[PDB]
Every structure is written in C-alpha cells, then in structure tokens.
Design an enzyme around this catalytic site. Structure first.
Site, mmCIF file in Angstrom:
data_model
loop_
_atom_site.group_PDB
_atom_site.id
_atom_site.type_symbol
_atom_site.label_atom_id
_atom_site.label_comp_id
_atom_site.label_asym_id
_atom_site.label_seq_id
_atom_site.Cartn_x
_atom_site.Cartn_y
_atom_site.Cartn_z
ATOM 1 N N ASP A 159 0.824 -1.384 -0.309
ATOM 2 C CA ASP A 159 0.047 0.230 0.098
ATOM 3 C C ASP A 159 0.963 1.028 -0.053
ATOM 4 O O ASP A 159 2.194 1.249 0.386
ATOM 5 C CB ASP A 159 -0.926 -0.115 1.192
ATOM 6 C CG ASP A 159 -0.369 -0.222 2.563
ATOM 7 O OD1 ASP A 159 0.713 -0.915 2.592
ATOM 8 O OD2 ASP A 159 -0.764 0.056 3.436
ATOM 9 N N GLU A 219 -0.140 -1.823 5.333
ATOM 10 C CA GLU A 219 1.078 -1.492 6.265
ATOM 11 C C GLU A 219 0.772 -0.164 6.955
ATOM 12 O O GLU A 219 1.136 -0.064 8.112
ATOM 13 C CB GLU A 219 2.545 -1.667 5.635
ATOM 14 C CG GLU A 219 3.366 -1.479 6.745
ATOM 15 C CD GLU A 219 3.731 0.101 7.065
ATOM 16 O OE1 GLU A 219 3.555 0.917 5.986
ATOM 17 O OE2 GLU A 219 4.754 0.243 7.797
HETATM 18 ZN ZN LIG Z 1 6.538 2.051 4.445
#
Ligand SMILES: [Zn+2]
Ligand SMILES: N[C@@]1(O)CC=C([N+](=O)[O-])C=C1C(=O)O
Ligand SMILES: N[C@@]1(O)CC=C([N+](=O)[O-])C=C1C(=O)O
Ligand SMILES: [Zn+2]
EC number: 3.5.99.8
Lengths: 425, 422
Positions: free
Chosen positions: A88, A158
C-alpha cells in the site's frame, strides 16, 4: 559465511539485472495502491513471483486486499529468512482533507530518469520491494547454495489507517489484515528483514501506538439567536469552544510527553511523539445550533515499555486539570518491540553491508526507530526482525531512489541471505 | 464492604435472568462464521442494561461486542470475556456421526440444569458475567476502575486454508485480538470459560500443517499397476495411509516430549489429524497423484513452530516419501505475567463463594486455545476461570447453582481488583 565466491557469481548476476530492477520498480510504483485498494499491486507481485517460479500464494482477509507470499526453497538445515515490504502507498485518489496539495505527479506516479527512479510510491515502498524481489531472482538464477528457505512476503495494509466510529470494515482496515495476518497464516521464518527506505541504516526497535478519541462535552445547545454571551471559553456551552482550550493543553502535554518517554534501546532510541490527526464537532450541513460535544483523534506513539492505559490516564488528567468533562476512548492499540536475538541477522547484514557499501552501518535517527514498521508483527511472533533499505526515508521526505543504491541494497540482501540461511537454526 | 454482601444477594435475586439470558443466548444458532445474531442479542442486552455497547468488528455480520461499567476513577480496570460462536454447525456431517442431535444446537432449562453445548461453550459463562455486571451496576457497587464487557466472535479454532478463504472461514484473527487492538483494553482480563472453578493462566499455541504426499503417475483404473508395495504405490492415498501411521506414532511421543510445567498450569501439547482429502469423489476413475492431511499441532509457549515443522518433515523423509509440509496457521501460547493481582482477587472471591482453595487446572484446559492468549500477548495479564466441565471434554450441561457461584465470584473479583490502585 557467507559462502566462498558463490557470492561473486551472484553479484555479477545482479549487475546484469539492473534493467529488470528499474522496470519492476517503475511498473510496481506506477500502480495506484492507496491503503484500501492494494489489490492491483498485489496481483502484479503475485504474477511476478509466479513468472519467476516462487510459487506465490495470495494470503488475505479479502479477495481484493491480500498479502502475497512466495518462497525460494533451501536444501535443508538452514535458518529461513523473510524479506518483507508493503503493497500500500500513501495518497488516495483525493486526500484533500489531509494535504493541501493532494495531486502532484510525484505523489501518484513513478518513472526512470537519469539514473534515478522518481515517485513517493517508489520510496514507500515499491522500491525496496523491487530490491529483494530482484535479490531473490538472482539467488535463484545464480543457483546460490542455501540450506534455509527465503520467504518472500509482500503485505497489504502496512500504513497506519484504522477503522473508527462509522468508518468500519473492508475500506478502512490495514495492519490487522497485513503482515501479522500473513505470518499467522504461514509466512513464518527464523528471521525477517523488513525492506524500507532507511538509507542503509538498520533499526530493530519500533514504537507501538495508542489512538485516543477525546470527546469533550458541553451544552446545552441553543439556536444561534439564543446563544449566551459573553462566556469564558472553558465554560462555553459550545463544545467546539471548549475543545479549542483542551487542544492547547494537549499540545503542551504532548511537547513534554515525547521528552519524558524518550528511551534508548540496543536497537535505536525511541522518541515517541503525539499528534492530533483529526477533529470534528457538529455537522457542516446543520449549523444553526452549536454542538454539545466535539471530538479530536490523537495519535500517541508508545515506546515498547509503556502500557497504553498509562497514556490514557495522563490524557484524562489533562482534561481534569482543565475542569472539563470528556470521554477518553482508545480505538487503537499496537505494541512496539525491540528485536530479541537479532544478532545472527544483524551480523550477516553488517558483514554484507560492509562488503557492498564499503563502510560500517550507521545508527538510524530516532524517528526511524519511533514509528510503525512491520518488524513489530514479526518480533511479536518470535521472529527477530529489523528494518533496512536504500533511500532517504519517505517521511523525510525523499522523492527518488538512485538506481545505484537499489542495486547495492539488492546485493546486501542477497549476501545476507547467503550467509544467514546457511547458519544452523 | 459491605457492598459485597449487597451484591451477593442482588445476584441470588437474579437466578431468573441468569437462566433466561443463558437459555436465550444458547438458543441462537451461532456456529463460527455465523455469530452475528448472537452478537446482536448481546449488543441489545448490553444496551438495555446501560453498558453503552459498541460493535467492534471486521465484518458487519461478524463482530465483537464491547460494553463498559464505568468506574469512579483511580482504579484498575478488568475485562470479562467470553465468545459468541459455538462449535457445531447443522452441516458438520463431515465431522460428527449425528451432527443434528439436539444438545449440539439447542439450550434449555431442566430441573437443576441448563443443557446445550452452546451453553457450556460459551453462552453459559457469558451469562454469568453479564449478570454479574448487571448486579454490580444495580446494587450500585463502588468501583474505582472500569469493568470492560467483551463478547467476542470467532474464538473457535476454525481457519481459512486452500480455497476456503475470507469471511466464511475466518475466526480468531477477527475475534478477541481484534477487539482488544481496537480499544477493548484493560489492566487485567478474566476469560470466562468452563474450567470447573479452576484457574489457568497458561495456554497452548498451535501450528497447523498441511502435509501433501506426492506419488503418481495416475492411471485409468483398468491400467493400474499391481501388486506394488504401499510406500511405492502410484496412488497418493495409499502412500498417505502409511504416513498417517508414522505421524500417529510421532504424535504419541510428541506430547510427552513437549509436556512442560508452568506456574499457570501444566501444558500437554497434543497432535491430531483433523482432515484428509485426496482426489474428488465425483471423478474417481483415475487415482490421485497427491493427497493431503491437515494436522492440528498444539505448541507449548516455548516451542518455535519451525522446529515442529522440521520434525514432521523428518517423519516423512524416514519413510522415504516426497511431501510438502506447509504451515497454514501459527499462533503463540502465553503464560500470563504479573497475574498476581487478578489471581489473588480471584482466589479470595473463590474461597469465599465456593468455600475451598482453588486447585490447579487439568492439563487439557491449559493446553488449548483460549482468548487469554491475545490478552497476555498484548500485555494484559489474563487467566481463565468458570463453572462446569469443558465442552471439549466434553460436558453437556451447567448447574444453575454453579452458574450463580461463578457470577458471584466474578462480581467479588471485580469489587476487589477494581478498587486496587493501577
Ligand atoms: Zn513504508
Ligand atoms: N474410456 C475412456 O474414454 C475413459 C477414461 C479414460 N481415462 O482414464 O483417461 C480413457 C478412456 C479411453 O481409453 O479413451
Ligand atoms: N476453546 C474452545 O472454546 C474451542 C473449541 C472447543 N472444542 O473444539 O470443543 C472447546 C473450547 C472450550 O470449551 O474452551
Ligand atoms: Zn470456549
């Protein structure tokens, strides 16, 4: 360890992969993948892994938001090493509420120029990902001798987004469905290197966090023509006006919080900071009567040794000190970790780095040790883990990688694996 | 003090709500995967009783329910926790000889007892602390710290694997740990499950292995080569039959070798082959080149899952078989740290209500998965304690009398612990 000049062969093999490295990074970086829509990036990585024979699997909570896990299988009897980067990226189709300049080319694209690769999505985090993808390709194609497995883990979600209030489920989830999910469903190994932009500085402590929704109460609400004035801000029946005072008290608290909870570890020095990431009170489409409540949302980083409740109670005391009545509600808590028993990975890494980069590693700055990284989930689950990669950090914030640096990082990764994965677990 | 005596006989005046809440909860179909309606009931129950519940969930029809009894301030907070999902689905004909027997799917009040696997696990212990909280609230018990009320989905050990992915197959990843990670934190946590009034504060972890034996080449039945020794059979099913025997032997010794004593209980980590499949029943004219089993291997808190994977791979190579040994689940088990304040608050209340010191729990009850693991993982010292024999055992009913004791133990534990300083 590592090897003999099995290493020399792999280094040359990586030299010959410079175009693949750039191409992979640009292609990956060019895919639109804000947290919440990482699927297309995931698919790219799955097929890349499939093409190169790493037998990938999609490991996800959702069929369009998933982790990708592949493997380079070792011959037996060695430690396994995970390489990990996230799928992401930061800026969604339009984050006008956060950033005032939510659409520049650098924020949503990636390209090869000079000997650089431009794009925020390259810095964070498709560039470091390309590096170990290539590293693994070289290891495989060079026929590197590895007793242990190399595990290839590309993870979704993340970035620190989180569901809260009416924003629930699929579109707003992140870390809960990312790295920890992937590991918990099979992506385990003895050690894990998390590839992020750290300018070749390794960290193996990171912060946890507690997010607080602080809702101040006031009232009673009155139709504008009836509002009582003048009234001292702290006594205002308008919760927004009280919140304004609370906000400056919390800013004072925050200035000192990071000082009081600064704490040095073997793995780095944690300077846990605080920020007010959102506020809302009333609704824009009915404003003729001021609201009886107003909420802010606080991001409070935690050093690994701070219970979130200690922080909640400190915020509650700031509120009490002001004479305000408020709800202090946590809606996120994740622990941070210092890696334990990192030495073999730290050593293999240090030795690879000295060889490739030619100097000792430098210690990272505090911010890089006081944030969220997916080393936390690995360490939580007993997999000693540190973060290391080329490039000035995205939060720096850098806007390009040097192709020379990426190639160096790929070599460091391949050498680290050829060493560590041939140690006995 | 003397609130205790007041609460105690607020509770005995509540035997009716206890029975009804347990029977109504236990009567809701809530197999893991479909716990939503149970969540709705709990939410609505919490709302009526003024606990300001919130749905905290990954999915809108599979969620945790978190409520709160707010304290006056300056005290430790305590979570009570039980899960909303139950073991048996009406379709588990693949598992149970008679998967439609009433005890699996219904709950009812009979004489002294409440029957139903869904009450034993876990609507019964849930009703116990639901009622305890209600009693604490109504009796106006003085509490410095909060009581956090946490009903979780997906506690039971179901997991996605292979083509079975996502919403219908998820469990623990969206359950207690999700609830805690998204706000349901406290200083301590009591996980209410059937333990026969014995407290445990260690539990097992687990690694699930998918073991796939390879063979072949497949032949149309009229061409199959015979005779061929089992381990050489081109039919993966036949090879796997020999491997199953070897792994049963390994499993016999595994639990002995990794048995380990902790302060919080003695862990005896066991192994079972939970499923097998090879080929498909609607195309059986050519035997399959691969066959898979799915192993449930419990871990004591100090065992790395990779060690276990290697042991299983070793069994495979000793038979001279080719196989993929693939982990598809790994969770850690924990012994609580800093459990003493809760342990003590519990021990005092228990001695007073049940009238004898606590005994150490049986090994199975601290060798399993319980949501003490997520709490302890997240730094919230947690133990499990409640009335009745373990469903996994498995028991079939609760004595209403025992349920009342448990409710009183819970209430007393809170009045103690939540009035100590954090
Ligand atoms: Zn990162
Ligand atoms: N009679 C069949 O068509 C059915 C099945 C197979 N087969 O197992 O591939 C071959 C046949 C054949 O000899 O043509
Ligand atoms: N932890 C469980 O809830 C999940 C599974 C079963 N069971 O398979 O019977 C029992 C439990 C228990 O009673 O504690
Ligand atoms: Zn249970």
């Amino acid at each position: 360890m590592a090897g003999s000049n099995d290493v020399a062969k792999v280094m040359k093999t990586l030299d010959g992969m410079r175009e693949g490295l750039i191409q992979t990074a640009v292609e990956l970086g060019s895919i639109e993948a804000p947290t919440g829509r990482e699927g297309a990036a995931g698919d790219y990585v799955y097929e890349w892994m499939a093409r190169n024979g790493f037998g990938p699997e999609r490991v996800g909570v959702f069929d369009d938001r998933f982790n990708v896990v592949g493997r380079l299988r070792g011959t037996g009897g060695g430690a396994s090493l995970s390489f990990n980067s996230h799928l992401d990226t930061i800026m969604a189709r339009e984050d006008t509420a956060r950033f005032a300049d939510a659409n520049d080319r650098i924020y949503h694209e990636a390209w090869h120029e000079e000997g650089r690769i431009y794009g925020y999505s390259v810095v964070n985090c498709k560039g470091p990902m390309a590096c170990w993808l290539i590293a693994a390709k070289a290891l495989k194609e060079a026929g590197a001798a590895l007793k242990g497995d190399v595990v290839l883990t590309a993870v979704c979600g993340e970035i620190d987004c989180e569901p809260v209030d009416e924003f629930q489920g699929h579109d707003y989830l992140a870390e809960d469905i990312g790295a920890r999910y992937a590991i918990s469903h099979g992506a385990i190994s003895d050690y894990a290197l998390v590839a992020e932009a750290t300018n070749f500085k390794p960290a193996w402590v990171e912060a946890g966090k507690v997010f607080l929704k602080v809702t101040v109460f006031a009232g009673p609400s009155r139709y504008t023509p009836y509002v009582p004035r003048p009234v001292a801000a702290l006594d205002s029946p308008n919760a927004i006006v009280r919140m304004a005072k609370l906000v400056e008290a919390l800013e004072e608290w925050a200035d000192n919080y990071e000082k009081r909870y600064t704490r040095e570890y073997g793995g780095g020095t944690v300077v846990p900071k605080v920020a007010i990431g959102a506020i809302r009170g009333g609704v824009p489409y009915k404003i003729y009567a001021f609201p009886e409540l107003c909420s802010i949302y606080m991001d409070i980083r935690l050093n690994p040794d701070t219970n979130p409740l200690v922080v909640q109670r400190e915020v509650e005391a700031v509120v009490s000190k002001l004479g305000l009545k408020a709800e202090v509600k946590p809606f996120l808590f994740r622990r941070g970790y210092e890696a334990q028993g990192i030495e073999p990975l730290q050593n293999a890494l240090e030795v690879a780095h000295r060889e490739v980069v030619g100097r000792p590693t430098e210690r990272p700055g505090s911010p890089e040790c006081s944030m969220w990284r997916d080393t936390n989930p690995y360490n939580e689950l007993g997999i000693p883990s540190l973060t290391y990669g080329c490039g000035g950090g995205a939060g720096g914030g850098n806007t390009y990688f040097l192709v020379d640096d990426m190639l160096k990082a790929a070599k460091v990764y391949a050498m680290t694996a050829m060493d560590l994965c041939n140690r006995t677990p």
